[PDB]
Amino acid sequence: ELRVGLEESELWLRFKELTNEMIVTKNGRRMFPVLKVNVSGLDPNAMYSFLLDFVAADNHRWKYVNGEWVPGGKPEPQAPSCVYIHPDSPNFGAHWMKAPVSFSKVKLTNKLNGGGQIMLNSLHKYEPRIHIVRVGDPQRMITSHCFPETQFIAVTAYQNEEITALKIKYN
Ligand SMILES: CC(=O)Nc1ccc(Oc2ncccn2)cc1
User: Fold this and answer.
1) Pocket around ligand 1: residues whose beta carbon is below 6 Å from it?
2) What distances in angstroms separate CA 11 from CA 7, 8, 15, 35, 149, one per listed residue?
3) What is the rounded distance in angstroms from the CA atom of residue 166 to the CA atom of residue 63?
4) What distance in angstroms lies between residue 151's CA and the mean position of ligand 1's atoms?
5) What separation in Å is there between the alpha carbon of 143 and the centre of ligand 1?
């Protein structure tokens, strides 16, 4: 059975319990925590690519008011659906399964200025999603997994001082 498990789930849940925030900038910012997964049940002999995208979690935006995240208005039009290709792609099943798969280099941005960046809307909530694509498959077999522990609000600056402090503590 194909199993894709979140690494450092306890660490993600500490951020999630405060409501997680990720900075977006012109030139793009790496995530903390970094999304990492363990994989079992691939064909060790087959070749696969790993893709990452971000799914809009709500039909409204968010605002931080009196130390609480609350509905903040109607959403902006959805950001272009940018996909990040894990730099190890394409690779054998055995490669993906022998050690955790880390998306350490993906950058989140609020400006379309190139560089394999992912564009997100500030004050909108996203859920990371990993796709496994089988190479050389006439059926283009793809299996996608969502990671609800890793949900965050995209921000130009931290709203929750507890998030600012958690980021410094664990990073
Ligand atoms: C049957 C089928 O739908 N196959 C498929 C294969 C690869 C695909 O490329 C892709 N690119 C970016 C994000 C996600 N997916 C999409 C779809």
Assistant:
1) 51, 53, 83, 131, 133, 140, 142
2) 9, 5, 7, 11, 9
3) 20
4) 22
5) 9
Query: Which atom, in ligand 1's list, is nearest to the CA of 53?
Result: 13
Quickly count: other Cβ atoms within 10 Å of residue 70's Cβ.
Answer: 10
CA gap 100, 79 in Å, rounded: 29
> How far is C-alpha 61 from the chain's CA centre?
18
**Amino acid making up residue 130:** I
Supply the DSSP symbol for 80.
P
Among the listed residues 168, 84, 170, 93, the one whose alpha carbon sits nearest the alpha carbon of residue 126: 84
36's tokens: 């990492």
Atom of ligand 1 nearest to the CA of 144: 14
Residue 9 CA to residue 70 CA, distance in Å, equals: 25
Domain ranges across the chain: 1-171
So what's the architecture of 1-171 in CATH?
Sandwich (2.60)
Give 64 Cα–ligand 1 centroid separation in angstroms.
Answer: 36
Query: What is the resolution in angstroms?
Result: 1.9
Amino acid at 63: K
Tokens at residue 48, please?
A: 């696969």
d(CA 71, CA 42): 40
User: Alpha-carbon distance 18 to 148, whole Å?
Assistant: 14
